Amino acid sequence: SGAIYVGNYRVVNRHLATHNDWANLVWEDSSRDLLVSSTTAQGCDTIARCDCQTGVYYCSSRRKHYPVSFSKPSLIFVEASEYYPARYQSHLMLAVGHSEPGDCGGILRCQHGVVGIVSTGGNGLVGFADVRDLLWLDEE
Ligand SMILES: NC(=O)[C@H]1CCCN(C(=O)Nc2ccccc2OCC(F)(F)F)C1
Ligand SMILES: [Zn+2]
Prior knowledge:
about 140 residues; 1 helix; binds the ligand NC(=O)[C@H]1CCCN(C(=O)Nc2ccccc2OCC(F)(F)F)C1; mainly beta; about 5% helix; Protease 2A; binds zinc ion; 7-stranded antiparallel sheet; 3-stranded antiparallel sheet
C-alpha cells in the first residue's frame, strides 16, 4: 500500500484505487497501473525531473529501504494476476530486489525527488511505475 502526494494530487496504483479515488478522478491509465485523484489539502512530495537510473525504494514486506539500480521506463510483459490479465505494462522500470504482493505503492526516490512507485515483482525482481514524464503533476 502507498501513494504520492504532490500539490492537489494523490497518485496511487490503479489496481488499489478506492471508489472515492474514481469519484475524484483526474487521470488514469490501465496500461501504466496508475490513477491520479484530486485532493483537498496540498501535498509536499516533489516529483523528480531527470533520467537517474539509481535510487532508493521502500519495501514494506521487509520494513526496509534498499538502494537499487533500475532500467529505463519501457513496455514489459507482466504475468496474469487477480488485477490484470497477461499484458505489457508501459513506463515500467525493473530492479533486482525483493518484492511480494503487498509492496505496491512504496516510493522509489533519487536525489531529485520521487521517481515512481512499486507496481510489480518477480523472483528477486521489483518493478516501478515511472511518474517523471507526468509534467502536469507540477501545475494547476
Ligand atoms: N501491476 C501489476 O500488474 C501487478 C498487480 C499485482 C500483482 N503483480 C505482481 O507483479 N505480483 C508479484 C508476483 C511475484 C512477486 C512479486 C509480485 O509483485 C510485487 C509487488 F506487489 F508488485 F510489489 C502485478
Ligand atoms: Zn534523479
